[model samples]
Target: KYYHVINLSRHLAIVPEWEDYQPVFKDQEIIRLDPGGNHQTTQLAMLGIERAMVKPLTVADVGTGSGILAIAAHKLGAKSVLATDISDESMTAAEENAALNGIYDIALQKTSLLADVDGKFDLIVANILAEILLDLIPQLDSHLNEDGQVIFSGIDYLQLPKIEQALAENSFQIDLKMRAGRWIGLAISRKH
Candidate 1:
C-alpha cells in the first residue's frame, strides 16, 4: 500500500513499498512485492539477491516481479541492467517505478524467465518458487556469464540441499546463502 523512498548511494534512489528496505548489493534495495502482481513473493523472498550481491556488480533481475531488483542493481553500479517479467501489468509498473527513481537506462522487458535474452552477466538475481529454481538451474549457463554469480531464491531451507546438488551438476558452487523467515537466498558461482 505504501512504499518508502530509499536513498541508495549518490547515483540512485528507490521509492519502495517495503518498510525494511535495505541494500542487498552495494546500494541495491528490495522495494516491494505484489502477490497479485508478477508472481510477487514476500519481502523475505527477495533478500537472496542482497546476500548474493554486496559489491558493485553487473546484474540481471530475472523474473523481475516489479523490477525491484533491477532498480536496486542499477543503483549499486551495475553497468548494464535488464529487468524481465512475464506480466505486462507488473512490467509496466516496474518501468514507471524506475522512471520515478530517476533511472532511465534500465533495460526493461516482458519475458518468461530469461526467455529471448543473450549476454553473460556478473550477477543474476532470481526470486521465484524453489521448484522453479530447480527446473531453471540446468539452463542457467545460457544466461550466466563466465565466472558470473547467481542469486537463487524463493525457496525454503528444506530445499537448500537440492539446489546445491542441482548447481553442482552444472559445475556451479554455492558461495553464500541468506534467509529471512522461510525464504532463502543462495549465491552460486561456476567452478574453475
Candidate 2:
C-alpha cells in the first residue's frame, strides 16, 4: 500500500496515502500506521520522543487518540507501550492502526490521564491540549519512573505561561521544546 512518510530526526513514520499526499523519504532509526487525524503534534511528538529516548525505556502514552505516539515509541526505543485514552471508541482505532503497522503488544486502556492504569513508565508522550495538560501535569509524577521524560504538545502561545506555571507546581522541567505553525511541543524532566 502507498504511504506518505516523514523524517522524525532519528526515525521515519508513514501514514497510508489518503488522497492529497505523496510519500517522501530521513530515513525510527520506520514506522507505519493508518492515516486519520494525522495531527501536527503527532509528527512533533514522534520527533521529540526520538530525541529524548534512552535505551530500554518503558512507555505510556496519555490521551493516546490515534495511538500514533504510542506506536512511535515502540518503533523507536521503548521496551513496551501502554496506550491510554478516555474514549472506548478509540481503542478500536488505536488497535487497528497498530495492527496496520504490524505492531502488537502495545497495551491499551480506556481512561483519562493515567487513571486505572497500572505501572510507571520511562517516557510518556501525549499530543493533548495545554488546558488538558494543565490538568494532567501535576499527576504525572505518580506515573513516571525516575529520570523519566514526558513529551507533549498542543500548546499555543497564549497557553504557554499557564503551562509553565502548571509544571512548576509539580516540580517538573522542560528540557527540550520544538515549535511548528502556531503550536509548540515540549519534553519534560524532573527538577533538581
Candidate 3:
C-alpha cells in the first residue's frame, strides 16, 4: 500500500490501484487508478512538460492507462486536458481517477492512439510502445499545434533507432531523454 501513493511536483498525488511497483502522495489532492504497471514510465515521462507549457496549453494524454497525466495536466491548470485509450477498462479507470483528483473537465476518449480526437493540442504525451510511437509520429502534424511539444515513452534501446528515424523523417528533434531502467522517455518538438 505504500507504493500506491505518489506526489508529483505540482502537489498532486497519484494513488494507483496497482499492477504495480515502488512509487512512493499530495496534500489532500489525489488521483487513483489501475496503473497496469506503468506508473514509473508515466511519472518519468511527465518531466518533459516542465520544459514547456508555461501557458495554459491544451493537452492530450494518449494511451492513457491510468489517466494520471491528464489529471496532472488539468492540475497544472491547463486550458483543457483530454485522455485517450483503446481499452474500455482503461477509460473507465481514467474517468474515475480524474474525479478522484477533484478534476471533472478532463475529457475522456475511447480509441486507439489519437484516432478519435479532434483539433490540435499544445502538448501530447503518449507513453505507448516505440512501434506505436512510430505510428503516432506522422500523425503529429495534424494533431499538434505549431511549436507544440511531445512526450514519448514505452521504448527500449533496441527499438530506439526506429523511433529516432521516424521522428527525424518527420522533423522532430529531441530536447531531452530520460531513462527509467531500460525504458526511454523523450521530449521532442518539430524543430522549433
Candidate 4:
C-alpha cells in the first residue's frame, strides 16, 4: 500500500516511503513517517499544533504512535521533545520514524501516558481516544507548566460535551475547538 506524501504545509510533507515516493518539493522539511498506513489522529493533531501560535520550549507527545507529533514539534522549533507510548510496536516504530526523519533529540519512552515522565512541559499533544482523554485530563495539571497548552485530537463530535466537562472540572480552558468530518481537535490551556 502506498501513502501519499502528506503535505503538512504547502512546503512540508510527511513522506513515509520516501524511497518509493521521491518527494519533489524543495526547501521543505520532509518528514519520514515509515509505514505511514492510516493516521487521521496524527494529522488532526498536527493541524491543531500549527494553529497554536506559540513555539514550545519543551514538548511532550503522549501516545506518540509513529512519533509524528514529536517530530513535528521539534521541526516547529521546540527546544526539547519527549514522546511516550504504551505499545512496544509503537515505540519501535516511533523510534525508527524519528531516525528516518533525522530527528534524534526526541526522547522516546515506552510507558503508559506520562507515566515515566517528570517535570512540566510548555506544550503537550495527545491524539488518543476520548475515553482515554477523560482518564488523562486529571493528570494534565501535574505535567503541565503554568498556562501550558495541550493539543488533543482523536475524539468524535458526540464526545465533545464529555471532554469539555472533564476539562472544565479539571481547570482547563478551551483555546480552540475544531471539527473535520466526525473527529474533533482541541487546543486547551491549563488555568493558572
Which candidate achieves the best TM-score against the true structure? 4
lDDT by residue for model 2 over 1-192, one digit each (tens)?
Answer: 344555445346454524333334334335555555345767778777878776878998888887878877777758989998889878988998888778889999988888787788888887888878888887789989899898888888678889988898899998887888878889889998
Q: Looking at model 4, which ten-residue stretch has the lowest summed lDDT?
A: 17-26
Cα TM-score per model:
0.75, 0.87, 0.85, 0.91
Question: Which sections of candidate 3 miss by over 4 Å?
Answer: 1-3, 7-12, 16-29, 34-37
Question: After TM-score superposition, what is the CA distance of residue 88 in candidate 3 from its true location, in Å?
Answer: 1.0
Q: Please, what are the lDDT tens digits per residue for candidate 1 over residues 1-192?
A: 444554533433444443455454654433343321122233433444445556666778877776677776676567788888888977887787787667889888787777687776788888887787887788689888777888776777888888888888988887766676666767788887
Q: How many backbone clashes does every candidate have?
A: 3, 2, 0, 0
lDDT for each of the candidates?
0.68, 0.78, 0.78, 0.82
Query: Which pairs clash in the backbone of model 2?
Result: 11-28, 12-28
Per-residue lDDT of candidate 4, residues 60-157 (tens digit):
99988878888888888887999998999988988888888777778988878887578888888999899998988988999998768899999989
TM-score of 2: 0.87
Candidate 2, superposed: residue stretches over 4 Å from native: 1-10, 17-30, 37-39
Worst 10 residues of 3 by lDDT: 19-28
**CA lDDT of 122 in candidate 3?**
93
Q: Name every residue pair that clashes in candidate 3.
A: none
**Better lDDT candidate (1, 3):** 3
Better of 2 and 4 by TM-score: 4
Error at 21, model 2, angstroms: 11
RMSD of each candidate relative to the true structure: 5.4, 3.3, 3.8, 2.0
